[PDB]
Design a binder for this molecule. Structure first.
Ligand SMILES: NC(=O)C1=CN([C@@H]2O[C@H](COP(=O)(O)OP(=O)(O)OC[C@H]3O[C@@H](n4cnc5c(N)ncnc54)[C@H](OP(=O)(O)O)[C@@H]3O)[C@@H](O)[C@H]2O)C=CC1
Ligand SMILES: CCCCCCCCCCCCCC(=O)SCCNC(=O)CCNC(=O)[C@@H](O)C(C)(C)COP(=O)(O)O
Ligand SMILES: [Zn+2]
Lengths: 95, 114, 297, 126, 208, 134, 86
């Protein structure tokens, strides 16, 4: 989800881009500014919210021990989903 | 306040040792300029020796000047026996180091150090 | 003033001096010591090089990481010049050849390329521009070097009106072609009077001309403290070096006396004590060994 | 005899190899460190520490790292008493200032005071 | 406490306690403390005037025969007025045992060199000169052994910073490696790691 | 404009409402070309040809001790006597009390979060004000 | 050119400041009624020797030690300060 400054420079997923009057763009002259074009904030928004039938859900990130530590998410708020603090997946009670 | 001496019982023996170390350095400076093929004069090297001796000239403790004479003898042995290279001799002449701001106003201009 | 170019540190290798310098001709004799004295402050140094990158290797230990940026440039390519100078707050010109070539004569090296660099540095918004002419530059000079260098000085002055133009007389150093020319010639003795200047004095003068805001638009003349006749200077060179490639233009320049310009400022007006030859000639000519000093006028 | 009488002040500044800039322009701070108020443990408040005045940290132009020029920026020393720290700073020629140890004063606690008959110190909930 | 706990060796503790009493009463002129650790290591903490008589005893006595000098060590502890703690690790091959002989000095009091007892010490205390500044009287050739030739400062003193005061670089103007004041492009990041809770109640010191 | 140091950026004496002198320590350095405040005034004095007789922070604190010696005795509350003489001097000129009621300038939590230039530049204090005004 | 302020440093408990204390309890008020636009800064401290600072015009400061004076001697030193104005 990369955009571009008016200087022609790609803004990173942090939001870093040099100013126009910043001399430190000279390090990319004849070379390239390596950015990653797979923004994790744009990819975790693309996931579907898991509709579960319980009140407390557990997430480990999938894969068992290949994920994150197993946390428990409360789903009592019907206004807002319950988001895992590690992997960013989000859950909704189906009632 | 009764301490064990290193070499000198008082300050007069200590000044004798300081004086003999200065004599040995003063004799050594032309040989050091020659065999390390330095770019300084013999007079400039003797000025650096005199500067390094006057740097410690405020010490009143016999044990501290005994250790200063011991460390000067060690540096002299590293100079006579060619163990130092040219670079270790020329480190007394801080030549590539730019001169620091000395007054208040230029230290104010360059930064925060008092 | 931008926040990344505010000076920080204590003036060392890892510091920030706030100088972003594009040094054209940095692979030569003056560029060596200018990049050494810039990168030891923590300055961003853009080195545009024409030559083999191997021939730039000696410029790499001269500063901290990322502080020397090497990039390709051609003298007849204004786009490469704009590509090199557009981030810099100072541009130093050191482009020079003692001899003319098949692809570059004295007018290309001294008139066309300095006017191109100064025009592009004006139209890129560069604050400071330092140009290096010669002390003996004149339109009516017998050598083509000094004629084209006087023309190029005039064009630099008219296309960058705030250019610091610097006149070195005859720069001597470890990689010079002044003491190393006389020590390897083993052309004659005439009535030529010279005051050569040491390269570290020239480099300290250039950096003081960068740091001084009063040096904008000035024309400095970098000369030594002692004037010498050509004959006893050559005899002193042969006496120190323990001795018992050229063109006719170089001969005309060695037989051209170094003029006295008291109306131009010099090394004393930049806070530089000019080092005499008697301290540094042994350091230069120690290479040439397998002395009463020269008489000053 | 084999013991000499040196009535002078103990001064080793010519022997430590510290340059003059980092002897005479530094202010040593001698202090017991404060308890981190994120925590109730007090085992970091048992010793005296010596630190120095923080000098300039600036941004590395390449990476944005914290570049420093102060060699003494990490020098933290540990002392059993205040006088050992004072003697070590005087021996090394460091100009110092000492903050005295702040102990917590003894509180008066009573669980029954949570349920007084007539005082304001009743808890509204427990 | 069987699987994960280190097994305690009571026999060696009793034997090293008996030999520590033995050395403390043969040499009461210099022995200040005698202690045995929980992992059975004997330490004889002596006065520094008895470096030669104690070490000559343990090397030559027929019940000690500590013929090998394993290691010679200093420790800077700046809170003590005798900040340097000189440590002699000794090995008896005859009785298959190790002893530790510990003494002290400050910056200015010389320690007597033990090259007449153990020639192995010839470099070790030489290193204690280079790393700590402890002078050793009557050493045969006492000078620096590890630092650079123009090195000012004794680095393993704990008031010496981690990076030094100088750093080298090549300088092409003077055509020479030069020394400048150290500027780090990234400062060493000091981590305050110590927990505010008491870890070992057996080591609790009595308060003021 | 003379860019100065803030309280986290200088070793600096502040005296509270009970007269206790206290000193900050340098946590970070001032940003850019900003400098410590008395350094600025002292450099201004040297430019003006009226150079003030101090160079270091300790010499400023010697001057500060010369003007009143309580300003360098840190974590100490010097007791101030002589209420009677001040009360006798207050009886001289009878100023009249205004009919306006005593209203403090901060009545609610709204008025608390922004008083000085650091709090007015604070986005967190702006969120506190916007949170208590809704 | 003229006196600008007066600073009187003293101790709360030291006997060497006692006469200075005896000056301020009795003679300060009619001093201040005599000089309403003159700042006479009384500064008490813990262990200081007594001192009379007299700041004059253009930054000039004279310095009188009030140690072990009686209140009469403090009165005379202060009226010499008021009458000098140099
Ligand atoms: N004694 C002296 O040397 C004096 C010198 N000057 C002036 O100072 C300047 C620097 O002198 P110096 O170091 O001795 O000269 P050098 O010959 O040693 O180096 C000059 C530099 O200019 C570059 N250069 C030359 N011609 C061209 C070209 N056509 N296109 C691109 N780059 C080019 C060279 O690059 P590359 O390595 O690729 O060839 C080199 O880096 C010159 O302008 C000279 O006229 C003035 C007075 C005295
Ligand atoms: C080429 C470079 C080589 C550099 C040489 C470096 C040598 C470094 C050796 C340093 C040894 C010393 O400085 S020990 C001197 C300290 N002495 C003292 O503190 C005692 C006071 N000494 C003096 O005043 C000395 O000038 C005299 C000569 C002993 C007496 O003079 P006073 O009388 O007036
Ligand atoms: Zn998860």
């Amino acid at each position: 989800g990369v955009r571009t400054s008016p200087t022609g420079e790609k803004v990173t997923h942090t939001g870093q881009v040099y100013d126009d009057e910043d001399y430190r763009r000279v390090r990319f002259v004849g070379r390239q500014k390596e950015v990653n074009e797979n923004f994790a904030i744009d990819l975790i928004a693309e996931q579907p919210v898991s509709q579960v039938g319980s009140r407390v859900i557990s997430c480990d990130g999938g894969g068992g021990a290949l994920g994150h530590p197993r946390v428990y998410i409360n789903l009592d708020k019907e206004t807002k989903t319950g988001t895992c603090g590690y992997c960013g997946l989000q859950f909704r009670q189906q009632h | 306040t009764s301490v064990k001496p290193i070499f000198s019982r008082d300050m007069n023996e200590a000044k004798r040792r300081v004086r003999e170390l200065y004599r040995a350095w003063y004799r050594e400076v032309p040989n050091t300029v020659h065999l390390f093929q330095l770019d300084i004069s013999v007079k400039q090297g003797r000025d650096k020796v005199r500067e390094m001796f006057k740097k410690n000239a405020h010490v009143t403790d016999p044990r501290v000047v005994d250790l200063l004479v011991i460390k000067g003898k060690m540096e002299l042995e590293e100079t006579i026996n060619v163990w130092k290279q040219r670079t270790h001799v020329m480190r007394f002449f801080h030549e590539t180091e730019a001169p620091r701001p000395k007054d208040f106003l230029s230290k104010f201009y360059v930064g925060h150090d008092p | 003033l931008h926040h990344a170019v505010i000076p920080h540190g204590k003036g060392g290798r890892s510091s920030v001096s706030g100088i972003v310098a594009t040094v054209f001709g940095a692979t030569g004799f003056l560029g060596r010591y200018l990049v050494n004295h810039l990168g030891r402050m923590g300055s961003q140094v853009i080195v545009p090089y024409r030559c083999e990158p191997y021939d730039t290797m000696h410029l790499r230990p001269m500063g901290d990481l990322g502080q020397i940026i090497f990039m390709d440039w051609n003298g007849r390519d204004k786009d490469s010049i704009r590509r090199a100078v557009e981030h810099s707050n100072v541009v130093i010109n050191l482009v020079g050849r003692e001899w003319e070539t098949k692809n570059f004569d004295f007018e290309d090296v001294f008139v066309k390329i300095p006017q191109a660099i100064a025009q592009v540095s004006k139209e890129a918004g560069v604050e400071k521009f330092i140009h290096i002419s010669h002390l003996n530059a004149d339109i009516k000079s017998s050598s083509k070097y000094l004629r084209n260098k006087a023309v190029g000085e005039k064009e630099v002055r008219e296309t960058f009106p705030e250019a610091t133009i610097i006149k070195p007389a005859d720069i001597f150093g470890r990689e010079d072609r002044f003491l190393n020319y006389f020590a390897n010639i083993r052309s004659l003795g005439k009535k030529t009077v010279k005051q050569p200047v040491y390269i570290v004095d020239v480099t300290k003068g250039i950096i003081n001309a960068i740091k001084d805001p009063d040096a904008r638009g000035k024309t400095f003349a970098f000369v030594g403290p002692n004037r010498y006749l050509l004959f006893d200077l050559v005899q002193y060179v042969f006496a120190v070096a323990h001795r018992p490639w050229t063109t006719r233009d170089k001969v005309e320049r060695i037989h051209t006396t170094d003029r006295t310009l008291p109306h131009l400022p010099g090394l004393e007006d930049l806070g530089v004590q000019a080092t005499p030859l008697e301290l540094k000639a042994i350091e230069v000519l120690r290479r040439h060994r397998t002395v009463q000093p020269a008489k000053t006028v | 005899t084999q013991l000499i009488t040196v009535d002078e002040k103990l001064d080793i500044t010519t022997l430590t190899g510290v340059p003059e800039e980092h002897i005479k322009t530094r202010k040593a701070r001698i202090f017991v460190p404060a308890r981190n108020n994120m925590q109730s443990g007090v085992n970091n408040t048992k010793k005296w520490k010596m630190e120095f005045d923080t000098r300039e940290r600036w941004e590395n132009p390449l990476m944005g790292w914290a570049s420093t020029a102060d060699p003494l920026s990490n020098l933290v020393l540990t002392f059993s008493t205040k006088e050992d720290a004072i003697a070590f700073a005087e021996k090394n020629g460091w100009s110092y200032d000492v903050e005295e140890r702040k102990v917590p004063k003894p509180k008066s606690k009573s669980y029954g005071a949570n349920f007084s008959w007539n005082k304001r110190t009743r808890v509204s909930t427990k | 406490t069987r699987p994960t706990v280190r097994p305690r060796n009571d026999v060696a503790h009793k034997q090293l306690s008996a030999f520590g009493e033995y050395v403390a009463e043969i040499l009461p002129k210099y022995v200040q403390q005698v202690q045995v650790s929980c992992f059975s290591e004997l330490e004889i903490c002596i006065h520094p005037d008895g470096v030669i008589p104690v070490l000559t005893f343990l090397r030559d006595h027929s019940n000690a025969q500590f013929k090998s000098l394993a290691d010679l060590t200093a420790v800077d502890i700046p809170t003590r007025q005798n900040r340097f703690e000189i440590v002699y690790n000794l090995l008896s091959l005859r009785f298959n045992s190790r002893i530790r002989v510990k003494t002290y000095t400050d910056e200015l009091t010389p320690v007597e060199s033990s090259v007449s007892v153990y020639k192995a010490a010839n470099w070790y205390e030489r290193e204690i000169w280079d790393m700590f500044g402890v002078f050793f009287a009557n050493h045969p050739d006492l000078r620096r052994i590890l630092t650079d030739y123009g090195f000012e400062g004794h680095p393993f003193r704990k008031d010496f910073p981690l990076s030094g005061y100088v750093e080298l670089r090549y300088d092409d103007e003077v055509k020479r490696v030069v020394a400048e004041p150290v500027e780090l492009a990234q400062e060493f990041r000091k981590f305050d790691l110590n927990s505010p809770w008491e870890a070992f109640p057996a080591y609790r010191q009595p308060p003021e | 404009i003379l860019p100065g140091a803030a309280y986290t950026e200088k070793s600096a004496t502040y005296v509270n409402t009970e007269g206790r002198a206290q000193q900050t320590k340098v946590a970070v350095m001032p940003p850019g070309l900003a400098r410590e405040d008395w350094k600025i005034i002292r450099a201004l004095s040297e430019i003006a040809g009226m150079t003030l007789p101090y160079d270091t922070l300790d010499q400023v604190r010697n001057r500060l001790e010369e003007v009143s010696p309580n300003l360098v005795r840190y974590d100490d509350v010097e007791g101030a006597n002589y209420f009677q003489q001040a009360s006798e001097l207050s009886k001289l000129v009878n100023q009249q009390l205004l009919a306006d009621p005593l209203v403090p300038p901060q009545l609610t939590i709204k008025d608390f979060y922004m008083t000085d230039s650091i709090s007015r530049a604070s986005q967190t204090m702006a969120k506190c004000v916007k949170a208590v005004t809704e | 050119l003229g006196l600008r302020e007066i600073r009187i440093h003293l101790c709360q408990r030291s006997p060497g400041s006692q006469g200075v204390r005896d000056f301020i309890e009795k003679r300060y008020v009619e001093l201040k009624k005599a000089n309403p636009d003159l700042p006479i800064l009384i500064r008490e401290c813990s262990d200081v020797q007594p001192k009379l600072w007299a700041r004059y015009a253009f930054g000039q400061e004279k310095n009188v030690s009030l140690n072990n004076f009686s209140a009469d001697q403090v009165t005379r030193a202060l009226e010499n300060v008021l009458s000098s104005k140099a």
